[PDB]
Ligand binder design. Structure first.
Ligand SMILES: N[C@@H](CCC(=O)N[C@@H](CS)C(=O)NCC(=O)O)C(=O)O
Length: 110
């Protein structure tokens, strides 16, 4: 990715995060992505999925997410504009009772 491509990809990722209470940066056949989506489904939370493998600038987006979050893998979850992390991170928040209130606070759960 060129520096302009990384910049454009970051802007794209930020706009998605800004315009969705819950965002799941994903890949279509990632088992961990499927797990987190299933959890959110069952919690009644609406999310925007973005499948990097189906985006033309998916590599640039993954590079931008690394720069932005230090994370190299999908799923890469944001809630209310804030970085959550991967499947494990989301499961951790579900485990300590913080996830539903976070999801409610930002509108992801009505
Ligand atoms: N501990 C991480 C593991 C996630 C993970 O390993 N994701 C794989 C996809 S199955 C990945 O992103 N591999 C590198 C890639 O596909 O870019 C989590 O719970 O989210």
């Amino acid at each position: 990715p060129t520096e302009e491509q990384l910049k454009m990809a970051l802007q794209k990722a930020q706009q998605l995060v800004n315009s969705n209470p819950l965002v799941v940066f994903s890949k279509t056949y990632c088992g961990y992505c499927s797990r987190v989506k299933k959890l959110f489904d069952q919690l009644g939370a609406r999310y925007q999925t973005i499948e990097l493998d189906q985006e033309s600038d998916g590599d640039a987006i993954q590079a931008a997410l690394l720069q932005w979050t230090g994370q190299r893998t999908v799923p890469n979850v944001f809630i209310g504009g804030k970085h959550i992390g991967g499947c494990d991170s989301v499961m951790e928040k579900h485990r300590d009772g913080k996830l539903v209130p976070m999801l409610t606070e930002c509108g992801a759960i009505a």
